[PDB]
Amino acid sequence: FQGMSDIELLETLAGTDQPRVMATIIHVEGSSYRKEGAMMLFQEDGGCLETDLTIKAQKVWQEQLPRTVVYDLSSEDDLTISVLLEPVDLKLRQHLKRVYDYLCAGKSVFHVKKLSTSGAVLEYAFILDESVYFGEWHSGHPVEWIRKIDENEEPLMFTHIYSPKERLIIFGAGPDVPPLVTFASNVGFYTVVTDWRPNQCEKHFFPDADEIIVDFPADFLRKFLIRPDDFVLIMTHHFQKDQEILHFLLEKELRYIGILGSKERTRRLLQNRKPPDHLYSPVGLSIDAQGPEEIAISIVAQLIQLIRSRKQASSPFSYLFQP
Amino acid sequence: MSDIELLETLAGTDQPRVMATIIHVEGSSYRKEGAMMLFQEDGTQVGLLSGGCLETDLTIKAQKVWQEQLPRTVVYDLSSEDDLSWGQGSGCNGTISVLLEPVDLKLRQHLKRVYDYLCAGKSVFHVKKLSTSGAVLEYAFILDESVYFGEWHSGHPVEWIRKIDENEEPLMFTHIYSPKERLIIFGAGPDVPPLVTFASNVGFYTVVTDWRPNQCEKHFFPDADEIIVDFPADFLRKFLIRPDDFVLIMTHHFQKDQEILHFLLEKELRYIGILGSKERTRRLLQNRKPPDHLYSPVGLSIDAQGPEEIAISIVAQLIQLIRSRKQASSPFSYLF
Amino acid sequence: MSDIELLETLAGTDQPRVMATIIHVEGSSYRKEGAMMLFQEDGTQVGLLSGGCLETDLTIKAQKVWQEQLPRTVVYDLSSEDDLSWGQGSGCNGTISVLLEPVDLKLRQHLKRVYDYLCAGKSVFHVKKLSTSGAVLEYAFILDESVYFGEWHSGHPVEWIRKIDENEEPLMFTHIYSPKERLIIFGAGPDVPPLVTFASNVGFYTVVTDWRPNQCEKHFFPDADEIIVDFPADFLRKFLIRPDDFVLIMTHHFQKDQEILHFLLEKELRYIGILGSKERTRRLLQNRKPPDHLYSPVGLSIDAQGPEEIAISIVAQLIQLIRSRKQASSPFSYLF
Amino acid sequence: FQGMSDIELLETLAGTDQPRVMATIIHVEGSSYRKEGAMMLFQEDGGCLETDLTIKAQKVWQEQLPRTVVYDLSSEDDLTISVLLEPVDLKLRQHLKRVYDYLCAGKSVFHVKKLSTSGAVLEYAFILDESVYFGEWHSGHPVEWIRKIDENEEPLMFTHIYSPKERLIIFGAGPDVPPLVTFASNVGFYTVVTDWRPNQCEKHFFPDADEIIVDFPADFLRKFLIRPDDFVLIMTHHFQKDQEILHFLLEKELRYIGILGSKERTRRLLQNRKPPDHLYSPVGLSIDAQGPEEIAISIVAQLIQLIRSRKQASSPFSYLFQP
């Protein structure tokens, strides 16, 4: 189940065309290691629950009809959850391919399932804006249907946000940067490494980096577009270079700016300028880390903390529920 | 990298090498006092001390040290680094003292002996006696008050250290070479491989144990030092867990987690981390005195989701405790 | 690489650069006096002067020259190179004087103007007036006795040069920036692409002409500066061949080779090479006075077989003649 | 015709299984740009001669019978030669695959064709030793048949030596070595680059090098086998390194040892030792070359001169004709 990213799962559907049934935990009552929203793909070709689901998935594909299966998780071995099995038909295959393309573009997608009392999927939509949506939704504006759900008489609704690959833009390719690229890549970040020294940027130093761009910071910032939902990490160990990068990103709306060094050094970098809103110096959690490997953990832990802490503020689509 | 990995590198390629050691730090610096780095003839460097334009100057100094076959102390004002860059320098408001030593046939042999003792699990106390000019007069590798090796001609190196100026005479440098910290992981589920990778990369000796042989294939855990396929009860009987070890219980099986925890209860341990909720771990303890260093929920609370994030959270917690815990817990404390 | 390719590199990436020039050589050295090299901030170097551990020291000197924004002369005893290596040094029994100049906004602008004149086909006479300390007092780029540019404040740079000590006062350095030598190739058969590559790599401006459009596709000659599809008679009417040009006749068509040769007969030319035997070329001349610089069979006699080997043979012959031919054939000879 | 190497041509037969007819110039009378022994492959899917051969090749494949075609080359446009057309049948395909494998191993192969008066191929063999041969040879020892050929009454014989890729082992990966690798590779050498500095040995510096081995000279010489028919080029610009390489190769039987530098420097390298037999210092022809690009031409020209000058001594199989 919960071991593969949403974008890593939708990617699997693109390089397939193979018969597949998708499982989703739409409800959890009590204790479970797997959370609500966790997904899994059954391909028509480990654990007692997954083996029963395999048989159910096989039936769901043949019937070409979704079903909700309830499992009384109650056992002193840790083996009540509600699993939704949907056949990835030509319609849903097409819609999920469109979802993947929007996450590749960096845009999040709000998904909503309208379920029947029996547990069948009546309607489903993929929302981008207050008007822009796609899917098998025949009844009104999906957004207006969600806001107008009844307190107790309307719990036959499932929502999930398909979040794109988070980007981590790293300024510097020194020998302390390869562990950070590895840890950030493994956790699920899209990593961009940029430095002006071509010998520092050989691909064998950063095999997990999605992009390695050899350029002076000023050229990079001119050519490469930095999105406001991106994470910037300045660790060149060159004052003038760090100052060149920071001064450019100053008025730019940015989620995170982390600078490797002391508060005094960052104060010196900002000489004669107003600091940006989401500046983190010293970078990473204070775990008194020593060396590149430990500092890299400290940085990635902080990123995870901020992605998950600001995910309690419902940041991508919270604006579609106020007014 | 790690002391044992740096000393491992000397056993390999056998080529001219100069060893750089930060013997003193004043102010702010990327690395702390005791940090090492290898300057090699092949133009490669093993480790970093600044990450700036400092390494560029040391390379030239290292080349001179090898030719002269004479150690040297180089002092770097990292703030006034404009006298080393194409730009405004590093910017770090600190001054570091780097000691460059040629890894000659004598020191090569001594460091190979240090490595063999760390492979055996024995720590080594290293001491250097420096001259006023900054060269190395004497050096020793201590195992006990009487047992020592190296290039030490005067008296008992141990008695020379205890009878020093005060909080170290500036002409003395000490460093303890210790073996890797051990991380004993109970469970081989698909959430354990990222934890093994992150813990291995940060410098832990990793032991993975589970009773299910197909979850324990070596390709799942290529960074694990040991993969032992056994029932927890057999593992605990056969494999000795020392008090300085780190235990991580993540089998996702209540009865299994309960036999592991109940065994380790009275055993003095550095760390016990159990994957799950405080309520689950209360049920696991089933009215027992909790161990002194029990961590449930495991890892720092960064609201981690998925195996990859939980693994970062745990390694973060492990780093925090190794670095927070009183540095006056050395294996050569008994000596002083 | 070539002067025009080195000056081309300054027009691009626009980053801190220090220019190294060999202003004097005593004894044996890999490069001759006038050889240049670029030290860049990105850690890349454009050209070489020794290829040893010299470049490693210059990099540090270049970094200082940029910071100080002041030129410097560095003298290297290449024999006593043990004071620069991990080993016994270079071994070359020579002493070189390297002049390091920061490519400041002023010099960047002047060198961009030099490049534009070489693109136009006009050579540029460069002169540096050095101080006793080895710094640069003045420098100029001469086009004619009166027309000059740069950072020259005293008199007429031309009159300053002619009125020097004798065979140059040690405080004077001169260098002629000339455009690429032209190699005009008649024929686009499958034996011509290796010759275009080897001639292009060595520094020739290559022009390929043939009357058969499918042999002249650009993918066959990616290194050719010009590919002109025309009958030889039309090419010779339209394209001007200067006396300092190099001609290579290799159409494998007797009548075509004969119209090309008969046209170039009275025309003063640096070089005319015809692919084939002396007998064939005797038949081509059909009782005519052979040109002064006719080479048939073409290339050095190394008993070459196939297009690739014949191409080496021809480029070898071309190099031999450019280097053998009297150096007192400069375009600024008329000035002195 | 003569534009593709023998080994480059036999390679083409391995990645084929496609119907193919091989042409060979078995005789030349007078003037021709193409020499005797030149080969070409016609595949059953530029110039007037090649177009006629294409039609003849098509007939030869259908008939599955070799034929000799004579072309009166006499024309004042340069358009008498004897072309042999042989269908690359399953038998010959198999034999030529074996020839290729021996050239990959570095062993030369002596080929002989026994032709009829009509121009058909009666017999053919591929000789390695005084006893070791393979092919479609039914009559005696091919070697003894060749030595005992009649002065004038036996010219119905064609011989050709299939020579392996010549190896050029370059010690040094400085910025002067990439043009030499390119020129040597283009002319047809198997190039091996070795240096002890990994940053000097990135593959993008030497894309034409067959092997790039990062090692100290002493380790290279221990691990990599140097054949007596190999060409060694010492150009590390490091005296101690060049001395380490030369001292090892001293008693070793070697075709060519070229050292970049002066005779005095090479004399200093050989301090207290007898120089090897095929030492070339200064390396390359004296064309007063300046810079890496010109020196590289000078070196490759010398190599070509020595391969072709010692090819007049019939070096690979001259020993099978003396005694």
Ligand SMILES: [Cl-]
């Ligand atoms: Cl900088």
Ligand SMILES: [Cl-]
């Ligand atoms: Cl309890």
Ligand SMILES: [Cl-]
């Ligand atoms: Cl050396």
Ligand SMILES: [Cl-]
């Ligand atoms: Cl004549």
